[PDB]
């Protein structure tokens, strides 16, 4: 989960 | 968001149930809170994260819980290897941020033990180099808190002493080194450390006379 | 069998820059966010930053933004951290940490001591802590070695080439005013051992390429 959150931050 | 752990030092006995507290400056979700163990000279080890999810191979005696600003790590039965420093850690993803509590030391509870107070006059090898270190040694005492007051010709001496406290028998030892130029050392006669500790009804003073005792 | 093998200890002058590395093996490096955490002497953990698995994205602690750069080398499975304008406050063990998908750090490197000081490498002077009646308390005596004025950390101290472990306690080093470290290595012994047992502290200081041995003999006081 949190890895996907960071992924989402860095994609933005 | 900052994390503040309490107590700073928790003193328990093996087999006890330990609860360590982590206090967030504002509400956080337990899923973004992790707990780490660190023994001296070792890297931290993840114990538990989120709603009491134990890290791989972390025994079932470790759990975590809490909500709002109040979170706890529980060790339901302390093993000797569990006496260590514990850190909570909080993380957020937008923006990516991590923060740690300042750490709680889990110390072995034991009876008050007065230190043996030993004093070591400067060695001649050091005096030959132009310096004099006097070492006051407080041996096998508990609890950790101790005060060393250096005295030179019965004056309160300061500015040039440092102490080292060991890690936690389960007692502590403390060395205090008073370091002088040889010239300064030779200007006075009586060197003493006066020690204050819970197990001492009155301050203990150990002294020597330069060149003698 | 996750391995995070960090580069060796570093000594730095103030205002210098440092580059620390962490070589990963035993896992798919490019699947993991990697983090850097530091711990100053007898202080707590402090986050510095993370880098995403591709190396394209980083995020730094606010206290390190501007002075820290994170990189990773997919070809060598190596995490790097570069930090500039070093001050003595940056003296710390620096840890790489692998982030589990939960966001917690499931595996850590062994750490990299970075010492930032205007002090120069110097071997220790080793002075006997000469046991006497003043270091004797009813059956128990203490002796030791004062391992003084060395830089940087660490020193390794043994007694009698390792044969003596009972009663040995090497204290945590203290940083002196001079910028040099000093420690005391103490042996609690039976008072009966004074003058019959030989006590030699063996001090290795790899950074200065120095070795010291000091036989510790009693004083009469
Ligand atoms: Cl949160
Ligand atoms: Mg999206
Ligand atoms: Mg120790
Ligand atoms: Mg380097
Ligand atoms: Mg990925
Ligand atoms: Mg693992
Ligand atoms: Mg000196
Ligand atoms: Mg050391
Ligand atoms: Mg050697
Ligand atoms: Mg030798």
Automatic annotation (TrEMBL), chain A:
Signal peptide: none annotated. It comes from the Viruses. This is Spike protein S2'. The chain holds residues 1230 to 1241 of 1353 of the full protein.
């Amino acid at each position: 989960d949190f890895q996907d959150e960071l992924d989402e931050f860095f994609k933005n | 968001t900052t994390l503040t752990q309490s107590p700073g030092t928790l003193s328990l006995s093996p087999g006890d149930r330990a609860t360590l507290s982590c206090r967030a400056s504002q509400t956080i979700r337990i899923s973004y809170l992790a707990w780490y163990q660190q023994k001296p000279g070792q890297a931290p080890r993840l114990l538990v994260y989120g709603p009491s999810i134990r890290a791989t191979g972390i025994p079932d005696r470790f759990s975590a819980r809490g909500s709002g600003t109040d979170f706890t790590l529980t060790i339901s039965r302390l093993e000797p290897e569990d006496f260590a420093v514990y850190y909570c850690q909080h993380y957020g993803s937008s923006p990516p941020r991590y923060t740690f509590g300042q750490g709680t030391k889990l110390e072995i509870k034991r009876t008050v033990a007065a230190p043996s107070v030993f004093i070591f006059p400067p060695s001649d090898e050091q005096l030959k180099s132009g310096t004099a270190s006097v070492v006051c040694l407080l041996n096998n005492f508990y609890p950790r808190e101790a005060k060393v007051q250096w005295k030179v010709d019965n004056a309160l001496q300061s500015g040039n002493s440092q102490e080292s406290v060991t890690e936690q028998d389960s007692t502590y030892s403390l060395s205090s080194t008073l370091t002088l130029s040889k010239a300064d050392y030779e200007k006075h006669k009586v060197y003493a450390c006066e020690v204050t500790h819970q197990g001492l009804s009155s301050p203990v003073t150990k002294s020597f006379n330069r060149g003698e005792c | 069998q996750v391995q995070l093998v960090q580069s060796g200890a570093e000594v730095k002058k103030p205002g210098a820059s440092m580059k620390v590395s962490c070589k990963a093996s035993g896992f798919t490096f490019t699947d993991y966010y990697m983090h850097w955490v530091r711990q100053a002497p007898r202080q707590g953990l402090e986050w510095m930053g993370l880098i995403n698995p591709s190396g394209s994205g980083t995020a730094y602690a606010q206290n390190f933004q501007g002075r820290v750069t994170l990189a990773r080398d997919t070809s060598t499975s190596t995490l790097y951290m570069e930090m500039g304008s070093l001050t003595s406050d940056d003296t710390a063990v620096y840890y790489c940490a692998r982030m589990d998908s939960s966001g917690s750090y499931d595996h850590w490197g062994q750490g990299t001591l970075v010492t930032v000081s205007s002090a120069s490498t110097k071997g220790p002077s080793v002075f006997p802590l000469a046991p006497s009646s003043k270091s004797t308390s009813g059956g128990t005596a203490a002796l030791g070695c004062l391992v003084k004025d060395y830089f940087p950390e660490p020193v390794t101290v043994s007694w009698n080439s390792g044969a003596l472990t009972s009663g040995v306690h090497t204290f945590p080093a203290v940083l002196q005013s001079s910028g040099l470290y000093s420690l005391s290595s103490v042996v609690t012994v039976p008072s009966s051992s004074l003058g019959t047992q030989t006590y030699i502290c063996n001090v290795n200081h790899k950074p200065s390429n120095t070795k010291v041995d000091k036989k510790v003999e009693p004083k009469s006081c």
